Ligand binder design. Structure first.
Ligand SMILES: CS(=O)(=O)N[C@@H](CCCCN)C(=O)NC[C@H](CC1(C(=O)N[C@@H](Cc2ccc(O)cc2)C(=O)O)CCCC1)C(=O)O
Ligand SMILES: *[C@@H]1O[C@H](CO)[C@@H](O)[C@H](O)[C@H]1NC(C)=O
Ligand SMILES: *[C@@H]1O[C@H](CO)[C@@H](O)[C@H](O)[C@H]1NC(C)=O
Ligand SMILES: *[C@@H]1O[C@H](CO)[C@@H](O)[C@H](O)[C@H]1NC(C)=O
Ligand SMILES: *[C@@H]1O[C@H](CO)[C@@H](O)[C@H](O)[C@H]1NC(C)=O
Ligand SMILES: [Zn+2]
Length: 696
């Protein structure tokens, strides 16, 4: 009584080859489920982490290579542009023959780079202002420095767009790096070395005298400046509550309550915002409503920038943009980034060019490329089976509301309302395949030259930013997908109350219409519950059924939610990551994701129980001394088989809101009595602690 189909056999082979049965499931289920895989594999030199997700993504890149590399006589314009963009990206010979000349032509348009200019104060400083300088990088090239001003959705009115003002990203992975001691020292050194390397190459190409001490001087003041900005930014721990983060006020209020003296001139928030919004012929007045997400950061920023000069600021300003462009120039400029890349990611080589390019074209033309990917690699049968699964999971979540003892009736009724209102996106939007006109018009304003790769990417920055700035006065399009189809992930949008499962993730081990149900539920089923539970975690719970930031919790049910979720904070916060140097995981910044991982797996299991009840046991897999309840957990754990480079473990433990894959498995299964039941785990074994956390 065993399944012997071709599809059952591949499932079993993959499961057996990846697992390590000589480990005890109740001592360490990560090694039991993934020991086989870890011993067989080594992280590629071009990868910072490697595992099931990464392999499936590199596989997806191959499909994109196949469909992008050969032009076809039947291609529509939208497709012709993507292939032309791919071909310009992979030429490399054409790119190298241009040296840095594409960058030199661009620097005059961002008020130059003082370290690589001569008499910068007389050329630009005369007609230079913080308002104009920051605005030019924001509105034309989408680079947000010092002050990140962007157009987004209104958290308290998900139909409109509003102007947000938030603290900017930093050159290094996180503010923690700017200690520049111990584990962050090498990264800080490579970063400033990276500055000087680029500054030297530009001056060399401009035939300018090179004063090595003057280079070190200016570029180290840039680091002492970004150190200050970095220390002024808010922690992620202090940005977890969207209610407290949402501070709406007019531009007049901002001028009163958040002034800035920069290079003597008083900063004008009305001149800064109009310098940006004029890029699309839009006028702004002092009565404009603005949402400030980092007011604390703006106040600490006032006495930082009074100290520095227009030159000192612009040296950091342009460096943040040049930082990203050297990779798109000749190999002399590409190489200047090596020591910095290795410090942050551990990688000794750069990803294959065709792999980089396929990803770039997919990231900028995601509907045109999604069309090519689904036509070549996606079934269509799959779309309807997943709808069925999302229906089963959504109901298990509602069903489970009644069993929850820490919520009162009125909060449960409103929790059920939001759940029923969740909008689902499966596979791909049908009109990217059927409506050729709509797709061509998405890219009509774009025109790519094949020998001019650098000019193409600049076009895409301006197009990407111009289209976002134009959204200020228009309503949120509801039909829009939050992700392309050629993506191996899934997403939830609190502003839209929308879960999405692109075609890229609807393949094994996650899902297949031909693999055992125990695997589907433990795979895509757990992912579906995970995305659903995002609408109810420490952040998504603040949004109602329409994407509006509004309290719908009773004082008691809110207080209890915090109480229940504090267990998971301490659990994961007590995990030490050997790869990150024994550092502890940040249980606060990972809470939302561990809630989703724990609720999601719970919802999937109860959906597989409900299925067995209505349908019964399916046949077991060959070569596995495991029943289907144990197969459920095995496949769920094998979704996360992976490992990190030490350099990137240090990076991700600060910047990744997810737990590392190994601790997602252990933390989640430690809180699951059903796992311990399935694997008959002793009490207080490592995988079955008597104290177990639970929110959803
Ligand atoms: C506003 S937003 O929509 O953009 N919010 C993001 C927040 C995180 C961004 C990361 N892109 C979001 O929802 N992201 C999708 C992500 C999907 C899941 C996930 O874990 N995916 C991992 C995949 C991975 C990759 C490499 C590796 O070695 C190990 C694992 C990941 O991406 O790291 C898929 C299974 C459950 C969640 C989620 O739901 O959080
Ligand atoms: C790369 O660009 C050069 C210069 O424009 C051109 O001669 C060459 O044919 C291109 N390569 C390919 C494969 O088309
Ligand atoms: C970092 O910011 C805090 C808050 O303003 C301040 O008290 C502290 O002195 C700053 N640290 C440095 C090194 O400037
Ligand atoms: C902003 O001020 C500058 C003078 O510093 C001026 O040239 C520019 O036109 C102003 N921009 C707007 C949009 O008012
Ligand atoms: C570890 O767990 C204990 C017990 O709840 C808790 O007091 C402590 O804060 C946790 N450690 C971390 C780093 O979260
Ligand atoms: Zn998540």
């Amino acid at each position: 009584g065993i399944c012997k189909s071709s599809d059952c056999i591949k499932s079993a082979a993959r499961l057996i080859q990846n697992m390590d049965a000589t480990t005890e499931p109740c001592t360490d289920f990560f090694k039991y489920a993934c020991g086989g895989w870890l011993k067989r594999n080594v992280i590629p030199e071009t990868s910072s982490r490697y595992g099931n997700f990464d392999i499936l993504r590199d596989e997806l890149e191959v499909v994109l290579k196949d469909v992008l590399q050969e032009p076809k006589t039947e291609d529509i314009v939208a497709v012709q542009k993507a292939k032309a963009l791919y071909r310009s990206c992979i030429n490399e010979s054409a790119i190298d023959s241009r040296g840095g000349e594409p960058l030199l032509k661009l620097l005059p348009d961002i008020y130059g780079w003082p370290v690589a200019t001569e008499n910068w104060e007389q050329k630009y400083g005369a007609s230079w202002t913080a308002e104009k300088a920051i605005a030019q990088l924001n509105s034309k090239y989408g680079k947000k420095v010092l002050i990140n001003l962007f157009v987004g959705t209104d958290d308290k009115n998900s139909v409109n767009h509003v102007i947000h003002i938030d603290q900017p990203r930093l050159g290094l992975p996180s503010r923690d790096y700017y200690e520049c001691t111990g584990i962050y020292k090498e990264a800080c050194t490579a970063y400033v070395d990276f500055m000087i390397s680029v500054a030297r190459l530009i001056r060399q190409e401009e035939r300018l005298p090179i004063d090595e001490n003057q280079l070190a001087l200016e570029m180290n003041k840039v680091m002492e400046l970004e150190k200050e900005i970095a220390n002024a930014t808010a922690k992620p721990e202090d940005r977890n509550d969207p209610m407290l983060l949402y501070n709406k006020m007019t531009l007049a209020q901002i001028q009163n309550n958040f002034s800035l003296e920069i290079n003597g001139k008083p900063f004008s928030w009305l001149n800064f915002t109009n310098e940006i919004m004029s890029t699309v012929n839009i006028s702004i007045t002092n009565e404009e409503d603005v949402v400030v997400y980092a007011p604390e950061y703006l106040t600490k920023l006032k006495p930082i920038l009074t100290k520095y000069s227009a030159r000192d600021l612009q040296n950091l300003m342009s460096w943040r943009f040049i930082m990203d462009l050297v990779s798109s120039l000749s190999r002399t400029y590409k190489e200047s980034r090596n020591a910095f890349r290795k410090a942050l990611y551990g990688t000794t080589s750069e990803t294959a060019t065709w792999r980089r390019c396929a990803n770039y074209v997919n990231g900028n033309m995601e509907n045109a490329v999604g069309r090519l990917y689904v036509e070549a690699a996606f079934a269509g049968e799959s779309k309807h089976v997943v709808e069925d699964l999302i229906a089963q999971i959504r109901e298990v979540f509602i069903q489970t509301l009644d069993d929850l003892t820490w919520m009162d009736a009125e909060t449960k009724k409103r929790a059920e309302e939001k759940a029923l209102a969740i909008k689902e996106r499966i596979g791909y939007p049908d009109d990217i395949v059927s409506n050729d006109n709509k797709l061509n018009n998405e890219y009509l304003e774009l025109n790519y030259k094949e020998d001019e790769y650098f000019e193409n990417i600049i076009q895409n920055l301006k197009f990407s930013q111009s289209k976002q700035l134009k959204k200020l006065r228009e309503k949120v399009d509801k039909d829009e997908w939050i992700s392309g189809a050629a993506v191996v992930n899934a997403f939830y949008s609190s502003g839209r109350n929308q879960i999405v499962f692109p075609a890229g993730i609807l393949q094994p081990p996650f899902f297949s219409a031909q693999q055992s149900n125990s695997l589907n539920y433990g795979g895509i089923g757990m992912v579906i519950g995970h995305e659903i539970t995002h609408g109810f975690d420490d952040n998504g719970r603040n949004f109602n059924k329409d994407g509006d930031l509004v309290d719908w919790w009773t004082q008691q049910s809110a207080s209890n939610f915090k109480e229940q979720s504090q267990c998971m904070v301490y659990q994961y916060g007590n995990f030490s990551w050997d790869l990150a140097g024994g550092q502890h995981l940040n249980g606060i910044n990972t809470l939302g994701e561990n809630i989703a991982d724990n609720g999601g797996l719970g919802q999937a299991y109860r959906a597989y129980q409900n299925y067995i009840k209505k349908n019964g046991e399916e046949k077991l897999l060959p070569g596995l001394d495991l029943n289907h309840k144990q197969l459920f957990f095995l496949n769920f754990a094998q979704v996360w088989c992976g490992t990190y480079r030490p350099e990137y473990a240090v990076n991700s433990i600060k910047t990744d809101v997810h737990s590392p894959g190994n601790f997602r498995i252990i933390g989640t299964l430690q809180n699951s009595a059903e796992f311990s039941e399935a694997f008959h785990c002793r009490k207080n074994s490592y995988m079955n602690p008597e104290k177990k956390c639970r929110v959803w």
